[PDB]
């Protein structure tokens, strides 16, 4: 009863998402886009209930796309499937340029590493 | 030669950061703030080169604060020390309301879990 949009650049990963969805098998039609541009066109043209969203795409960043989705009150739910970790989001999606991201709890050694990274940066 | 601002609501954590900076011993003046408001005041008034920043504070979110710093072109380096994971950033800092956040690589089981999370939210 619900339609899915898969936004992911890697065709092998697209194949798996598609494959895993069909194993579960509870969905109507599954659309694919490798880019944000084509994702926006499909959301405008088709009725989509859920989006599986990668972050690093060829034509841009999935967090900006998701932020635009919410700004414009788009009627979709989203699941992020990505390789991105916290620092990747902070630096590569947000562009906030932090020296490091330390997950609590941290060791002294890990703490020192973050300081070395500051020093090497100057 | 480098001054530090610690922005962290938990006094024990502040104490540890302070301990570790002293052990490394290459810093001048180490300021502390438990809140964003006090951090902004210290940044406006004192010489500070590096900030150790927490995300969940009592009076707001470190990501928003970080975003303000960059907006205002504050000449300061930042290291994030926090308990926040990716989903915490996407949903609690950004407010993007994603159903789930799947880190690649994932298992079929984990994938199913994220779909269940979509279903159980109707
Ligand atoms: F390229 Be995705 F963010 F894994
Ligand atoms: F409160 Be913090 F984000 F660890
Ligand atoms: Mg990608
Ligand atoms: Mg906190």
Residue numbers in the entry:
A (entry chain A), B (entry chain B): 1 to 122
Source paper text:
MaeK and MaeR exert their function by activating the expression of L-malate catabolic genes (maeP and maeE) and the expression of their own genes upon the presence of L-malate in the medium. Structural and phylogenetic analyses show that L. casei MaeKR proteins belong to the citrate family of TCS, as well as the characterized DcuSR and CitAB TCS. We also solved the crystal structure of the REC domain of MaeR in its activated state as well as the structure of a mutant version defective in the phosphoacceptor Asp. Altogether, our analysis has revealed that MaeKR is a non-canonical TCS conserved in Lactobacillales and that the structure of MaeR acknowledges the α4β5α5-swapped dimers as a new class of dimerization for RRs.
Crystals diffracted to 2.1 Å and the asymmetric unit contained two monomers of MaeRREC. The dimerization interface involves α4β5α5 structural elements, the main dimerization surface exploited by canonical RRs, such as the OmpR/PhoB family, but in MaeR β5 and α5 are swapped between subunits. This swapped conformation is due to a motion of the C-terminal β5α5 structural elements that swap from one monomer to the other by a rotation of about 178° (calculated by Dyndom33), using the loop β4-α4 and α4 as a hinge. To accomplish this swapping, α4 is reoriented and placed perpendicular to α3 instead of parallel, as is observed in the OmpR/PhoB family of RR. This motion allows the interaction of α4 from one subunit with α4 from the other subunit (α4*) and promotes new interactions that involve mainly β4 with β5* (and β4* with β5). Contrary to OmpR/PhoB dimers, where both active centres are placed in the same face of the dimer, they are located in opposite faces of the dimer in MaeR. The swapped MaeRREC dimer displays an interface area of about 2018 Å2 and a solvation free energy ∆iG of about −34 kcal.mol−1, suggesting that it is a tight dimer. The residues Thr82 and Tyr101, which correspond to the Y-T or aromatic switch, are oriented towards (inward) the active site. Interestingly, Lys104 and Tyr101, which contribute to the active site and to the Y-T switch respectively, are provided from swapped elements of the second monomer. In this way, the phosphorylated state cannot be reached unless the REC domain is swapped.
